[PDB]
Amino acid sequence: SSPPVVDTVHGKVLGKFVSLEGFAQPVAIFLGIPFAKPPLGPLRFTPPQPAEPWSFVKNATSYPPMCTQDPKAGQLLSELFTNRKENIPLKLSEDCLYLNIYTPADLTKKNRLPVMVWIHGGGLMVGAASTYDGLALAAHENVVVVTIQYRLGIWGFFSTGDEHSRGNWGHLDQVAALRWVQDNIASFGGNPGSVTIFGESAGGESVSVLVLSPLAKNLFHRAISESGVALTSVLVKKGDVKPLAEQIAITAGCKTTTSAVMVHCLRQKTEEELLETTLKMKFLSLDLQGDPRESQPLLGTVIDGMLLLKTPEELQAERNFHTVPYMVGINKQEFGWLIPMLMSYPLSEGQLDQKTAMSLLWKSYPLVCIAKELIPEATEKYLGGTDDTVKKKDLFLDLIADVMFGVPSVIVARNHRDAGAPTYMYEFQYRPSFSSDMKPKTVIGDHGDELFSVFGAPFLKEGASEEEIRLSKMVMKFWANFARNGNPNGEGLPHWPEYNQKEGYLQIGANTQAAQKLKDKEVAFWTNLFAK
């Protein structure tokens, strides 16, 4: 055959055909298509600029580098989220504003398939796009899968508070990609009039963010947030960030006289000079000893008055705005093993007691952000339920998760519903087989777990039972359907109640059935404890 050559605004791109088991027309895969001028030099800590066009045929057939990050963390995370056979080894570089397209269309003849842009998670500190392969999700549901990349950590979120570096560069890059989709996805047999953005974790948050953003307007028509929203404190910083900006500055060896000089100096820094800082700053890790309130969690989404004019807990009160179908879901055990294992959570002891717990919950401030005077009544309502210690640890994990995703997700759901727009919700309760040999079997539906199903891992990786194969094949149809009509439902699929006043949702998994009031009892509990 002849490699597929799609004509774009900036030039002619070249991909490779990949036939999937059980299909006729192979899928044209494009890896490494630039969507914005490489953010190097004076372009560090600034909005993404349009990319220069090319003279011939760009052979975009290799995996683009992942934005600079913790190479060991990034490779680790890439190994736990991938859906393809073997994980792919990637490189780091400032030049990472790329994306990948998996169109199962017949380029020869005009096509207009729905598009599904995927925003990967990774706490805005790590992660990449190539990690997620759409091949299966593309062919199986006839949708063009697009995976984008955006600057991470310092590169994408360093902010001095003022205007010499408002911040949210990462989120501006996601918006920049979406713009590229709107202007190019058509030549790939996709439809710019039906783009659906969906993410998981940080990516999940980024989604909710772009939703409340005035910039992201008309760039998408449907959104999906998997485990993580905008009301998820940990990723959204509020208040005077100057201190954090200065703290990074000094660490890099930069005078702090004025924000202007600060930003200027960091521009004088190299990639390694900034990768070492990202390391010394120790992000994505809970610092035991030291006042919890001081511990810096991570550089993330901020209020720059551009991408986000106000905080999320503000924009949700207003109705006068653009609304679109929004699917928001969570997992049974978000804080089961993944996160803890990563952030090196102090649980090696086995069980936990009313006293010891109170400490962690407190020291976990950079995550749950809970006032010390609350820890007591907090641990009681959750762990105090039984004298059993082996259940305190579990209830502690179920607790830590209900604060980061539980209540938050539901609160975003109710408002979106109230705002006067289509709203759906789910709860993944399944344990993948592609998990790690080091993950306990007592943990079902951990963090991100739903991804394997969503990205049809059962069809790439081997050793998957027919049960799991049918599950994954199912969630893709729901997802795909939601992408099409904005309503997940269809023929051959269980009924998914629209999250309205009845507050019903779908329990996906072994037995995929509907249910009502998700974490309701819980939300209410925190709707007061968090109000003193």
Added chain:
Amino acid sequence: SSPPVVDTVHGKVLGKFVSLEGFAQPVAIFLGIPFAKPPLGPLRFTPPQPAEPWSFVKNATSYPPMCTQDPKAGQLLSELFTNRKENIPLKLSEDCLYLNIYTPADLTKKNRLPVMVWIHGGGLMVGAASTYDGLALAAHENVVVVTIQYRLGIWGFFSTGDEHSRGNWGHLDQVAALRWVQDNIASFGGNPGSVTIFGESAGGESVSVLVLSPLAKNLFHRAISESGVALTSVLVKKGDVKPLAEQIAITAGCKTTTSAVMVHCLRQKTEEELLETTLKMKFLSLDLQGDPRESQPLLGTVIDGMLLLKTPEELQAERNFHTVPYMVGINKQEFGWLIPMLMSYPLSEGQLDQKTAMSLLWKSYPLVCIAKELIPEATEKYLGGTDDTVKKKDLFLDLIADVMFGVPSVIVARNHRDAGAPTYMYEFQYRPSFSSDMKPKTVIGDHGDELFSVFGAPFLKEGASEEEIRLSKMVMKFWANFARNGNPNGEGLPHWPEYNQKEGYLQIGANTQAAQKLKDKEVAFWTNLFAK
């Protein structure tokens, strides 16, 4: 009450309220308002670029840094000139393009008070805006006072002689501030139709430079030059200025292949590296031995073809240009103590002889520019009188005070009158009680001594005698009056005649009154000796 918040073209500005004995209305003070994008990175050695708008409310409540300069030399000059009880220490930074504002207007009401933009002095090498508190002047004479900082030294006046680095970067910034006042001052209760500029020493010169510049036309409607004008050669480089550049580059450790390579190489140097280079050139201090010509004088205004299209001398010959009220005044003993005290002049024995005076005068070529074969002729007209070593040391000083300010001022003042525009001259004759201890109690009208009766020091510092209080209240009246109507006159004020054909001027002091033909004798003389 509630901190002052004003809306400017670039964003909101948060100020602070300050009260003053005798006035109910609290004066609003804004510190550190940026009138340009921090001239950093490649912006070095280039025109002032418009500031970037902030997205929220900028806190203009801190003292802005002063442009990089001799940290000690600069701090010292600030202690001396300051008009506040307690001097304020300052940080050094390249990011120094800011201005302070003092409005005695109620910002919750429409107000259009005349504006007085002050340009500090310091040989274009040192100085700052935060040094001069506008509080008194403003309240007392009901006007808006704006102290601005402009680029100094290398950063402000480094020229290669050509398009790769014209020069006068500092003068541009000055104008850059005027354009800021014209498009913003209206928000701080200022009338953009009555902007008056007034400087002292180096500031007095530049104020004259704007008067001859096309770029400044329509940015001010009244000017005041205190102890400094454009013909004051020292602060205006003439002839090929390339050599200076090459010697500045060489010192800084730069190549000198071409002009371009030169400018480009300095842009690469660091603030610390140029600051260390500024201290190697030894710019303020007057050398002793060696040949006067080889002696490196200083940087300064230059004929670039933008700010000035030709030497101040020529320019003053054409009246076809627009004209505005100009007030040019000097001080009885300009070279009395202040200047020498810093330049470490060879005065110590308290007495000077004929033979030595000629030798010294010559060693001051960078300050007077007189041929050694002429010195004899001059040293006679002044020192040919009484044969007393003491009266000589005092006469040799009145000698420099004439060749620096005296003659140059009057000629500038005379040429303005000849142009057909309102002119007013003055001579300060008073010794404030705010001087140092190392200052001889026999110097009446030292350099800058008016700066205490102009910025109402008697109402900010302690001790001020009623006489010294009555003086200050009188100058501020004349000054504000000039700024308002372009005429210093008003109620309860002696008559100040216009420097018309009768050549009348004012002798401000304990007992103020009008006179005639100020320094008319020396001018006539010095104009002749310069026959050659």
Added chain:
Amino acid sequence: SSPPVVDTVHGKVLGKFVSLEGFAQPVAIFLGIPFAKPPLGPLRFTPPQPAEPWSFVKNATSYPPMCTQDPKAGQLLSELFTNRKENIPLKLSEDCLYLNIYTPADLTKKNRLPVMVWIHGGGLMVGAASTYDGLALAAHENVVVVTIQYRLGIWGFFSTGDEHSRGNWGHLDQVAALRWVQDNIASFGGNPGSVTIFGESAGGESVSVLVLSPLAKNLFHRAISESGVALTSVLVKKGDVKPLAEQIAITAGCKTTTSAVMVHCLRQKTEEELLETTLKMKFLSLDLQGDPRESQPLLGTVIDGMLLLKTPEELQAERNFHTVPYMVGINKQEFGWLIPMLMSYPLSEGQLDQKTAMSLLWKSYPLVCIAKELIPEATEKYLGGTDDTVKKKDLFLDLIADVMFGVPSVIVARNHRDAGAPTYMYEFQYRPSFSSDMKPKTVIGDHGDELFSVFGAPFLKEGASEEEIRLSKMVMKFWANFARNGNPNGEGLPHWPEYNQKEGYLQIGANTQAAQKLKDKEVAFWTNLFAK
């Protein structure tokens, strides 16, 4: 009397009159006129931007800097080509985009003499326009002589094969210069409507590229490629250029993660650092050990997509374009010394047999580009004649000369004629008395030997036999004659047949007369071998 004062587009320029012994009309000489801004800092590896306008009278009285190149080599070349009295010492600089003018016109009036823009050669690595003095030519044939410069080595030809750095910067310069010519030459007595470009060696290839380039169209009306055309393989990089880039980047100490990264990294390096790399690569020198194929001889012309949309071999096949009188020429013994010497060829023995030559033509792969299976066929065709190991050398040399200048130059002529356009050819056969004392007297008409004739060296230097002086005149008239009407023929000059189907050319030397079929058997044979 007073220096010439011409007013160009970007400003006034001052030059100096210099008369040539004999001529009453003095020639106006200008040196160092910038036709582009200096490609320093961020403008490196980018297209030449228009020069910045100056405000006064720029003195064009010093020789401009020759672009960065090997200092030793750069001098050596300047010494073996210069036609002026005493060689001139030159400085290196990134800022070198300048051209020299030698107008013989009487600037006070309005003259429109023909203009000849000379593009100096040097392998696109070393060279300089100040080397060639045009006082003679401009005077003797009454024409405006121009000597333009253009980025070299890495600085003018580093390409990655993508938009991040397409390449051909040096060519893009030669163009920008030609443009400056069209918009300014008029004020120097020249006729922008009758421009004629010409250059030797790499300079010549540049002519052949402009003529074949669509951008170049309308920037000239006559062309002269002396010893070098666009079909001289060694100068035009075909295939994937990315490999060479990853080689340079690595030698300059850079990361090769992406092309966008390689460039950014090379832009940081100091001009001296890159020069180091230029000396590390070892260009212009024959790699005796290694792989003749992997041994990149020198980066150069490429098919960017801006200047060249396709290989010159695919361009000539299209008569659908703009045609202009072209004069292609070659010398009797091109690879007879100057080249074998500079490259340090192992022919110090003064002889060599077949088993050696066959091995030599191989290592010479970067020049001849002959396969390892053709070596015998080509060796047996040029050396299989005699057995005299000394005369087998002059044939091996003549061999390399035919594949680089011989055949190629002719094929270019045959294609220009056959495309319908005035074509002319010549073979210079003379040994100037200005040759190095190290060049054998047996080598006649070596690379560059015509220069001493074209620029009339016999009139600026001493020791010109009565014969040469005459030759130098004749060729000069021929040249200017071709610049005047695209026809070398005139009065008192041997008839020069147009290179039509009879393939008539002119043999220039001691005895000058036409001939037919130049290198006929040569182009034949060689096209056969290369047919694979």
